[PDB]
Amino acid sequence: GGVKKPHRYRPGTVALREIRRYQKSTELLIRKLPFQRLVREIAQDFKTDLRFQSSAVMALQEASEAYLVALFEDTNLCAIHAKRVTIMPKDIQLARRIRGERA
Amino acid sequence: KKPHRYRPGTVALREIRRYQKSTELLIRKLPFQRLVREIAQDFKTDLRFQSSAVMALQEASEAYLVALFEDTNLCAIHAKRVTIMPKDIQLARRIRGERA
Amino acid sequence: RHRKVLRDNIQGITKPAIRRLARRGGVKRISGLIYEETRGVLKVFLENVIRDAVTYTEHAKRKTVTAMDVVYALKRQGRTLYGFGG
Amino acid sequence: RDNIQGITKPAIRRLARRGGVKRISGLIYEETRGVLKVFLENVIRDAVTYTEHAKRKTVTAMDVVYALKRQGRTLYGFGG
Amino acid sequence: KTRKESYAIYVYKVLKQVHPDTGISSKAMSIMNSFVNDVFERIAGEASRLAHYNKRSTITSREIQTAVRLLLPGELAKHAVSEGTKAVTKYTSAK
Amino acid sequence: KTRKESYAIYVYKVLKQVHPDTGISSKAMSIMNSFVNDVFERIAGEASRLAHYNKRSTITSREIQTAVRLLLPGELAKHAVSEGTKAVTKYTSAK
Amino acid sequence: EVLELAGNASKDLKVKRITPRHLQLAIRGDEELDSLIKATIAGGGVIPHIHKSLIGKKG
Amino acid sequence: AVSRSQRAGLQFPVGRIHRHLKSRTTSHGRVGATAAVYSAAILEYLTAEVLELAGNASKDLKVKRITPRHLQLAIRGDEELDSLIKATIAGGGVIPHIHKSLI
DNA sequence: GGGGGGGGGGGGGGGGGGGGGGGGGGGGGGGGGGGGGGGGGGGGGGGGGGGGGGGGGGGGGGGGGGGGGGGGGGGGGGGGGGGGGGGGGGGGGGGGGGGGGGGGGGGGGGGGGGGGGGGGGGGGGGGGGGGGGGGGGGGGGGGGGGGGGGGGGGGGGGGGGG
DNA sequence: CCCCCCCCCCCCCCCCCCCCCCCCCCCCCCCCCCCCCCCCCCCCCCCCCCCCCCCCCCCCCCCCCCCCCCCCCCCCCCCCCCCCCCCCCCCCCCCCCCCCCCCCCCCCCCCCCCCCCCCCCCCCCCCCCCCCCCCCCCCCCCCCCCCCCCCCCCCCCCCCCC
């Protein structure tokens, strides 16, 4: 063409680039304020008028991202065991049944 | 002469029913006792065993292997098979955190 | 002397954040239903933890949920955390 | 005949059936044996450590029960 | 021969109020005794951890109570607490 | 009162012996502080039960050793046991 | 709570004594006790169950 | 006057560890002379093992201070430490890894 | 659809291992009352930390579109357990010598208790100073657009001759 | 028979075409803020030193119960035939990833006030300790009773094959 076909990475290339990137870093991946509201909202539905040390909220965020990330590694093993590269709700459910959790 | 044969999978379902109905131990005893004593011998020699001790070990092992076969089956079924394979036992132990 | 009603904050765990978490967990491709499933699984996890943390807080007759409360609650459920207490 | 082979296909097959398993690959038998060996090593090692500490030479049901509990595999019905 | 305490006779009494005409095998009683010992241990343990977190030395019925809320699943806890408050009350009011 | 015990000065000493020119961020020291408390709670716990199971009321260096053999993985146990032994023997050699 | 459910499990089997199997039936059968009692019950076996996809002949 | 730590040839506080054992006692509980000594040695040794490895990692990254990320590479990296330390290490991220079937 | 052969179920029955009912005991709990001591709750009190409110700006998020990719389905094949029939040496149950598992009863290092005392961590508070991460600024790559034969290197027939 | 020389035929194995604009990436660089770093006491805190118990070990005593054996009983391994099942390939459509664009909400920086919580100090209801009295539960021994569970008979239903 004129300025020819604008460059385009093939599906999967940027995704691999992403795993390399996030796997080598340590920051919290969920935005902070929205995660703080989720915490306040769930807490409130158990007991009204509660306050929070800011580090209490940071502790729940670290615990939560560590729990999700490890659950996605297990979910990824269930997808691959099934010969797929795409994780699905059934992969997450299989990982939690075997882990002995539920919901 | 007498030509009667059940289809592959029919006796197998009958066995599942029979064995889930019952509670007895399923590994023969002496063989298990021997295995236990041999494994123990590498941690300490001239050891004796209360009878109730070998029995507790057998009850724990069989409950463990049976429960491992349930998760293993779930992994085979997840992969659309009905036959459990070593990779299913492996996937199941890996997720349980036992690794090996 | 005022307000603000908290609702639907689970949608604050956005599709990009969930994708980042999956990337760190080594996931390459994500189906469209994973996002509502992840939200449900996070809600349950936080409910269980916040429920125990708030129980320690009340027991101590405090109104403030402390990092220690969270740390003991994470410990009771077998999810020990280092960096605040344990 | 090695002891671990005393745990036979038929016995392994019965455990799987109680586990609701329908069809078994041939390689499953050796794998199950390795798994049982590891489970038994982890538990006996802890039982025997309780025995030695008590200065006995007889592994008791309680030593096995405390070993199982330590590993998150609590057993009811044998004391403790 | 040294005495081994057990919860068996109390388990049997509770059994009688519940199914006056039912029995219980030896192996089953051994299981119930393990169950009772296990639950008391998890409860006293949490209750003393509670006491320690709060820089206190007394295990009061209030710690036993929070420990039950931490250890039992919803309904079980609802009734258990209820059974607990009810025994203390009936005992507080006596001679 | 207000003063809270920490293991940080001791962790720093050990860090200087293994890596003389290496520092530790406060976040990292916080983790090491939790790690040490955790391991100690686990060892004292196992030593107590261990004593209990044997109808003993005294927790000696012998209970601590067995606690250590139950808690650490193969090789870490051997080296820890030998360092435990060495420090007891030296300690008693002065009394 | 456990004797009550174990006791029903044995009456619905027209038997007089509660066994380990009855205790296993009562416990794994109730969501809350199942959750609370993770211990292995010696001599209890498992709840009967066959995955729908193994049961078959299909059509 | 020689401290009990100095008397034992240790950096970890024997007197304090002895104190903490006496208070986790259990009623008529007694704590032997040498129990605290042995305890301080196990604690000092484990601490030494973790710092040795974290320090090697902060070094292969041309850096002076050990971070939670270094503690996490050191622990997940060693079979035995990994087995002994199940706790979540805030700020440590994970060990980079991508399944061969995704590449 | 029918037979043909099985398993399975239901109800009934019997013996025997298991369970129970009894008496008897005694060191050990259990309870009582009285005395003394101690944990803790209130009540300020003061300080510290947590929402909250404000404002500014850029990274994060959302939506959209397009195409490539990947999952599902279907078919087929070879192959691998299931089922069957057959064969047999160890395992299982019962009985019996022997050896530690408890049970006991001291005594002595060892551990606590009490009192005194000299160090020993431990915040607090400026204060200086010092790694670090982010920003920048080039530099050496792995793949998206595929690419295009070109070799060795088996591989499986294939066919024909020996 | 059999074997050996063709004979395509992928096939995998480099190889030889061009990337090529991001993609890291790695070195450099520099403010910056937090991390030490002295000071500064100082309540703590850990060591000592008698003074007084004391629990545990250890030899001895006891004695159920573990191993071992023999006699009696049973599960295992097997080779084989069959058919389904797992695997592999192909086909196809749908779905999700890459990219673009525009936007805005999360972040960052400040402060500030007020809640609330900890800390201390005061006070006192509450628990422990003790001795005495008493009941008492686990054990032994006993020993009659019994629920179970394997077995039997008869019938019904299911599965496989024809």
From Swiss-Prot, chain C:
GO terms for biological process: nucleosome assembly. The modification N6-succinyllysine is found at residues 15, 61, 75. The modification N6-acetyllysine is found at residues 15, 43, 63, 75. The modification N6-(2-hydroxyisobutyryl)lysine is found at residues 15, 28, 43, 61, 63, 75. The modification Phosphotyrosine is found at residues 35, 72. The modification N6-methyllysine is found at residue 4. There is a cross-link at residue 15 (Glycyl lysine isopeptide (Lys-Gly) (interchain with G-Cter in UFM1)). The modification N6-propionyllysine is found at residues 15, 28, 61, 63, 75. The modification N6-methylated lysine is found at residue 4. Keywords: Acetylation, Chromosome, Citrullination, DNA-binding, Hydroxylation, Isopeptide bond, Methylation, Nucleosome core, Nucleus, Phosphoprotein, Ubl conjugation. GO terms for cellular component: nucleosome; nucleus. The keyword Transport does not apply. Demethylation is performed by JMJD6. The modification Phosphoserine is found at residue 31. There is a cross-link at residue 75 (Glycyl lysine isopeptide (Lys-Gly) (interchain with G-Cter in ubiquitin)). It is found in: Nucleus; Chromosome. The modification N6-lactoyllysine is found at residues 15, 61, 75. The modification N6-glutaryllysine is found at residues 15, 43, 61, 63, 75. The modification N6,N6,N6-trimethyllysine is found at residue 4. Belongs to the histone H4 family. The nucleosome is a histone octamer containing two molecules each of H2A, H2B, H3 and H4 assembled in one H3-H4 heterotetramer and two H2A-H2B heterodimers. The octamer wraps approximately 147 bp of DNA. This is Histone H4. It comes from Xenopus laevis. The lineage of its organism: Eukaryota, Metazoa, Chordata, Craniata, Vertebrata. The chain holds residues 18 to 103 of 103 of the full protein.
